[PDB]
Design an enzyme around this catalytic site. Structure first.
Site, PDB file in Angstrom:
ATOM      1  N   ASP A 163     108.068 -24.492  44.920  1.00 54.36           N
ATOM      2  CA  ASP A 163     108.198 -25.730  45.714  1.00 54.36           C
ATOM      3  C   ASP A 163     109.577 -26.368  45.765  1.00 54.36           C
ATOM      4  O   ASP A 163     110.088 -27.075  44.884  1.00 54.36           O
ATOM      5  CB  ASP A 163     107.141 -26.621  45.028  1.00 54.36           C
ATOM      6  CG  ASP A 163     106.966 -27.976  45.642  1.00 54.36           C
ATOM      7  OD1 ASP A 163     107.439 -28.254  46.721  1.00 54.36           O
ATOM      8  OD2 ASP A 163     106.367 -28.898  45.028  1.00 54.36           O
ATOM      9  N   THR A 164     110.182 -26.225  46.906  1.00 58.90           N
ATOM     10  CA  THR A 164     111.473 -26.706  47.455  1.00 58.90           C
ATOM     11  C   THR A 164     111.657 -28.202  47.472  1.00 58.90           C
ATOM     12  O   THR A 164     112.741 -28.853  47.389  1.00 58.90           O
ATOM     13  CB  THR A 164     111.250 -25.977  48.819  1.00 58.90           C
ATOM     14  OG1 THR A 164     111.859 -24.634  48.641  1.00 58.90           O
ATOM     15  CG2 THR A 164     111.454 -26.572  50.131  1.00 58.90           C
ATOM     16  N   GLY A 165     110.523 -28.880  47.567  1.00 59.02           N
ATOM     17  CA  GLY A 165     110.309 -30.305  47.599  1.00 59.02           C
ATOM     18  C   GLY A 165     110.179 -30.923  46.219  1.00 59.02           C
ATOM     19  O   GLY A 165     109.928 -32.140  46.073  1.00 59.02           O
TER      20      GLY A 165
HETATM   21  C1  LIG Z   1     107.966 -38.363  47.913  1.00 62.13           C
HETATM   22  C2  LIG Z   1     107.229 -37.033  47.696  1.00 62.13           C
HETATM   23  C3  LIG Z   1     108.258 -35.922  47.646  1.00 62.13           C
HETATM   24  C4  LIG Z   1     107.666 -34.534  47.873  1.00 62.13           C
HETATM   25  C5  LIG Z   1     106.917 -33.798  46.812  1.00 62.13           C
HETATM   26  C6  LIG Z   1     106.348 -32.433  47.194  1.00 62.13           C
HETATM   27  N1  LIG Z   1     105.258 -32.273  46.295  1.00 62.13           N
HETATM   28  C7  LIG Z   1     104.045 -31.639  46.795  1.00 62.13           C
HETATM   29  C8  LIG Z   1     103.486 -30.814  45.656  1.00 62.13           C
HETATM   30  C9  LIG Z   1     102.343 -29.869  45.516  1.00 62.13           C
HETATM   31  C10 LIG Z   1     101.008 -30.465  45.115  1.00 62.13           C
HETATM   32  C11 LIG Z   1     101.099 -31.376  43.922  1.00 62.13           C
HETATM   33  C12 LIG Z   1     103.034 -32.634  47.326  1.00 62.13           C
HETATM   34  O1  LIG Z   1     102.772 -33.822  47.106  1.00 62.13           O
HETATM   35  N2  LIG Z   1     102.269 -32.080  48.220  1.00 62.13           N
HETATM   36  C13 LIG Z   1     101.178 -32.844  48.940  1.00 62.13           C
HETATM   37  C14 LIG Z   1     101.873 -33.742  49.846  1.00 62.13           C
HETATM   38  C15 LIG Z   1     101.670 -34.661  50.972  1.00 62.13           C
HETATM   39  C16 LIG Z   1     100.536 -33.931  51.684  1.00 62.13           C
HETATM   40  N3  LIG Z   1      99.455 -34.176  50.946  1.00 62.13           N
HETATM   41  O2  LIG Z   1     100.688 -33.235  52.632  1.00 62.13           O
HETATM   42  C17 LIG Z   1     100.195 -31.727  49.217  1.00 62.13           C
HETATM   43  O3  LIG Z   1     100.302 -30.573  49.710  1.00 62.13           O
HETATM   44  N4  LIG Z   1      99.058 -32.127  48.638  1.00 62.13           N
HETATM   45  C18 LIG Z   1      97.822 -31.278  48.733  1.00 62.13           C
HETATM   46  C19 LIG Z   1      96.992 -31.742  47.520  1.00 62.13           C
HETATM   47  C20 LIG Z   1      97.416 -31.173  46.209  1.00 62.13           C
HETATM   48  C21 LIG Z   1      97.206 -29.677  46.200  1.00 62.13           C
HETATM   49  N5  LIG Z   1      98.188 -28.757  46.723  1.00 62.13           N
HETATM   50  C22 LIG Z   1      98.357 -28.032  47.819  1.00 62.13           C
HETATM   51  N6  LIG Z   1      97.312 -27.969  48.680  1.00 62.13           N
HETATM   52  N7  LIG Z   1      99.490 -27.353  48.153  1.00 62.13           N
HETATM   53  C23 LIG Z   1      97.252 -31.595  50.114  1.00 62.13           C
HETATM   54  N8  LIG Z   1      96.913 -30.813  50.986  1.00 62.13           N
HETATM   55  O4  LIG Z   1      97.045 -32.776  50.518  1.00 62.13           O
HETATM   56  N9  LIG Z   1     107.626 -33.641  45.479  1.00 62.13           N
HETATM   57  C24 LIG Z   1     106.994 -33.869  44.339  1.00 62.13           C
HETATM   58  O5  LIG Z   1     105.801 -34.199  44.495  1.00 62.13           O
HETATM   59  C25 LIG Z   1     107.892 -33.702  43.167  1.00 62.13           C
HETATM   60  N10 LIG Z   1     108.456 -35.077  42.891  1.00 62.13           N
HETATM   61  C26 LIG Z   1     109.775 -35.217  42.932  1.00 62.13           C
HETATM   62  O6  LIG Z   1     110.491 -34.243  43.268  1.00 62.13           O
HETATM   63  C27 LIG Z   1     110.275 -36.597  42.553  1.00 62.13           C
HETATM   64  N11 LIG Z   1     111.239 -36.350  41.473  1.00 62.13           N
HETATM   65  C28 LIG Z   1     111.210 -36.966  40.309  1.00 62.13           C
HETATM   66  C29 LIG Z   1     112.412 -36.662  39.498  1.00 62.13           C
HETATM   67  O7  LIG Z   1     110.231 -37.610  39.968  1.00 62.13           O
HETATM   68  C30 LIG Z   1     111.181 -37.480  43.469  1.00 62.13           C
HETATM   69  C31 LIG Z   1     111.066 -37.375  45.003  1.00 62.13           C
HETATM   70  O8  LIG Z   1     111.031 -38.853  42.939  1.00 62.13           O
HETATM   71  C32 LIG Z   1     107.819 -33.185  41.668  1.00 62.13           C
HETATM   72  C33 LIG Z   1     109.212 -32.746  40.978  1.00 62.13           C
HETATM   73  C34 LIG Z   1     107.354 -34.209  40.662  1.00 62.13           C
HETATM   74  C35 LIG Z   1     108.095 -34.101  39.267  1.00 62.13           C
END
Ligand SMILES: CCCC[C@@H](CN[C@@H](CCCC)C(=O)N[C@@H](CCC(N)=O)C(=O)N[C@@H](CCCNC(N)=[NH2+])C(N)=O)NC(=O)[C@@H](NC(=O)[C@@H](NC(C)=O)[C@@H](C)O)[C@@H](C)CC
EC number: 3.4.23.16
Lengths: 99, 99
Positions: A25-27
């Site tokens: 994950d790039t994000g």
């Molecule tokens: C402001 C948000 C920035 C983007 C986000 C991308 N993360 C993905 C991660 C993968 C799942 C946990 C995310 O939320 N994805 C959702 C995002 C929004 C969306 N929902 O479309 C997703 O696919 N969620 C799935 C549910 C979880 C299951 N995963 C999956 N299906 N791929 C979904 N469909 O809804 N980054 C993060 O969540 C990461 N956070 C950060 O990078 C934060 N960094 C720090 C230092 O805290 C920074 C922005 O403050 C990691 C390093 C936390 C330490």
């Protein structure tokens, strides 16, 4: 290898002794794994995602093997919904986005 | 292009009459933009990640352009700390991960 995004970019990683499934994950700035035990000393930290803040615990310098590629750096463990591999380890393996 | 991951991958897109900065996220299933007033019917929903779930509005068939490449697809609008481009749209501009 080249990975397409029609499916989740899911890979098997060895976290020494065990094998896991992680999301490239790039994000994500950092690397976070589901609650597990590791050989180390740790410090409590807080990270964020879309819903808010969570308390995690940091483990410095852990060797990870991502698809057979070697990386050595920080690993956060706490209540994350999916194990994810962040930019911290991706750059070690020399991962880039192409289009 | 070829985007390295030394820093967060931020790109400029066009949605509505606006040019905006968004994070390219291979760990996002969906595309999520910060609160903005688009015309159109939407259906409501919940998405989560690290921290919990936020409530957002689902708009269908919204045309974008991710750094000069057109896409069309669903976009979610709600209170995200950052604009996020998910796979729904990366799959359309032909983006891959390569290591
Ligand atoms: C402001 C948000 C920035 C983007 C986000 C991308 N993360 C993905 C991660 C993968 C799942 C946990 C995310 O939320 N994805 C959702 C995002 C929004 C969306 N929902 O479309 C997703 O696919 N969620 C799935 C549910 C979880 C299951 N995963 C999956 N299906 N791929 C979904 N469909 O809804 N980054 C993060 O969540 C990461 N956070 C950060 O990078 C934060 N960094 C720090 C230092 O805290 C920074 C922005 O403050 C990691 C390093 C936390 C330490």
């Amino acid at each position: 290898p080249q990975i397409t995004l029609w499916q989740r970019p899911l890979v098997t990683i060895r976290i020494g002794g065990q094998l896991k499934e992680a999301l490239l994950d790039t994000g994500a700035d950092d690397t976070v794994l589901e609650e597990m035990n590791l050989p180390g000393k740790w410090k409590p930290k807080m990270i964020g995602g879309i819903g808010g803040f969570i308390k995690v615990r940091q483990y410095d310098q852990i060797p990870v093997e991502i698809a057979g590629h070697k990386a050595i750096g920080t690993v956060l463990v706490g209540p994350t919904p999916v194990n994810i591999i962040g930019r911290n380890l991706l750059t070690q393996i020399g991962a880039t986005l192409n289009f």
